[PDB]
């Protein structure tokens, strides 16, 4: 029925909360599609890909009709689970998701547009 402990209880309860905020990733970093060495990179792209694309296209005068085509992945790149790193949201924008890595191994995305 004392104090001091109370400030230690406030600790002990939070440490468990932190544990669940780790035991969440693990069994939730499983589930269905949840693998291949690019798993971090894939989860990155997925947390990208959607959740986006509010703005659309007002261009310029060229000397050449320059256009680009994206082909979809085939059986070879899928069996050995390669990743899709190109997206096009509007008939005017080619997006690349250049998977970079800082010096310190922190994976980040260079989003060339």
């Amino acid at each position: 029925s004392n104090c001091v402990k109370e400030v230690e209880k406030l600790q002990e309860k939070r440490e468990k909360r932190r544990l669940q905020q780790q035991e969440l990733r693990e069994k939730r970093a499983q589930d269905v599609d949840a693998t291949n060495p690019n798993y971090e990179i894939m989860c990155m792209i997925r947390d990208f890909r959607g959740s986006l694309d509010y703005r659309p296209l007002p261009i310029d005068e060229h000397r050449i009709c320059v256009c680009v085509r994206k082909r979809p992945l085939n059986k070879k790149e899928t069996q050995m689970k390669d990743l899709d790193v190109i997206t096009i949201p509007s008939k005017d924008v080619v997006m690349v998701h250049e998977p970079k890595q800082k010096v310190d191994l922190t994976r980040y995305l260079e989003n060339q547009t």
Partner: protein
């Protein structure tokens, strides 16, 4: 044991390899026929050498050059008997200072026996640590076939270590104009594989043999002998075992703070003419002072305007731990030596007790105690920017690219390798930032 395996590629790597195993036989005491007086046909040197049947102690090295003129000297020289002949592998047409002929056209057809033979060496061992690769950053053979060879060694031997011994090209003895291209290429492809790359500025070796040995136009011989002595200092902590020396793999760990930052500037202590005689031996303090003068340095750079990330001192000869500690005290604060705010400013010292055996008639004045410092400093990035300039004029006009593309490679591989280089430079920058 805890075995190692040496590999020597290209003119430079093979000749410097011959100087290296020359010195190895001298220090450890073996005659060109491969016989040793003291051994019983499991010791500190049985990692670099294997025992045969008749006590014919034989190296654990594979030599390769695409044009057999440089290896034939091995089979004509004093050590023709020393080697198992099957590991002196040669080609026919030299890569002709062309990286792409190493990495693609010429090397493809020979790599498989190169690795069946390296295999034939690896099955001799009971617990192999890693491979020591000796090559030049310049010539086509040593750049191309080493880039590919490592790309293969990472497949067949993933768990094992891979230490580079690299030869930055000097304009004075440069045998090609396209040396920057080859260098940038083999660094780009070799980076993600190699664990620790000791770099040798040929310009620096030339300046050393200009000052301290007073040779006006030093031959490739002199340079190979000097570089060999330094390499013997580095490997000595692997080839001997006192209670005062630790594995080079023990403090390899402390030299490489980031996967891409694995280039330790080396520094070698007493370098004096055997001709210019009359000489007083230097104390531990004096050679430890010399380990910080850009003269006695290995790569052409300036660590005084750069930060440190580690420091190693491999002493060999007569050295008491207290002498080292005192010299380290005299050096610590008295100089403008700076560490990054994320690193303990500690030194680890490998005291090896065997003296430095120099060469018969080798213009290295023999000495009693020496030190070789491995400092992982950020000023080493200088040596990269000296490349990317000589590069970014030529590649600005795509001059000379047509050869490399004309032997298999695309263009975009150049813009990619170069972009990756600039990335590396900006990483040697990001090391320098602090916090608050």
């Amino acid at each position: 044991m805890r075995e190692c395996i040496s590999i020597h590629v290209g003119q430079a790597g093979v000749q410097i390899g011959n100087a290296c195993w020359e010195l190895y036989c001298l220090e450890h005491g073996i005659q060109p026929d491969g016989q040793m007086p003291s051994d019983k046909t499991d010791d500190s040197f049985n990692t670099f050498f294997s025992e045969t049947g008749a006590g014919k102690h034989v190296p654990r090295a594979v030599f390769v050059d695409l044009e057999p003129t440089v290896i034939d000297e091995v089979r004509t020289g004093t050590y023709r008997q020393l080697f198992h002949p099957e590991q002196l592998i040669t080609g026919k047409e030299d890569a002709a200072n062309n990286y792409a002929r190493g990495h693609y056209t010429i090397g493809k057809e020979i790599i498989d026996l190169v690795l069946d033979r390296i295999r034939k060496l690896a099955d001799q061992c009971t617990g192999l640590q890693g491979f020591l690769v000796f090559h030049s950053f310049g010539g086509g053979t040593g750049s191309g076939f080493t880039s590919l060879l490592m790309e293969r060694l990472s497949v067949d031997y993933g768990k094992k270590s891979k230490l580079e011994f690299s030869i930055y090209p000097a304009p004075q003895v440069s045998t090609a104009v396209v040396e920057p291209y080859n260098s940038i290429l083999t660094t780009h492809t070799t980076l993600e594989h190699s664990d620790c790359a000791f770099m040798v500025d040929n310009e620096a070796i030339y300046d050393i043999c200009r000052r301290n040995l007073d040779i006006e136009r030093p031959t490739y011989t002199n340079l190979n002998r000097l570089i060999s002595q330094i390499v013997s200092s580095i490997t000595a902590s692997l080839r001997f075992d006192g209670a005062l020396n630790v594995d080079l793999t023990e403090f390899q760990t402390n030299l490489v703070p980031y996967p891409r930052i694995h280039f330790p500037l080396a520094t070698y202590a007493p370098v004096i003419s055997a001709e210019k005689a009359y000489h007083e031996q230097l104390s531990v303090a004096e050679i430890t002072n010399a380990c910080f003068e850009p003269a006695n340095q290995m790569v052409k750079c300036d660590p005084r305007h750069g930060k440190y990330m580690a420091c190693c001192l491999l002493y060999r000869g007569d050295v008491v731990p207290k002498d080292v500690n005192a010299a380290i005290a005299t050096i610590k604060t008295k100089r403008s030596i700076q560490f990054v705010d994320w690193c303990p400013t500690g030194f680890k010292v490998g005291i090896n007790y065997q003296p430095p055996t120099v060469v018969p008639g080798g213009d290295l004045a023999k000495v009693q105690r020496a030190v070789c410092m491995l400092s992982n400093t950020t000023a080493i990035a200088e040596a990269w920017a000296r490349l990317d300039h000589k590069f970014d004029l030529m590649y600005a006009k795509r001059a000379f690219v047509h050869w490399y593309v004309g032997e298999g490679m695309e263009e975009g591989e150049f813009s990619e390798a170069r972009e990756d280089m600039a990335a590396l430079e900006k990483d040697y920058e990001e090391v320098g930032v602090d916090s608050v």
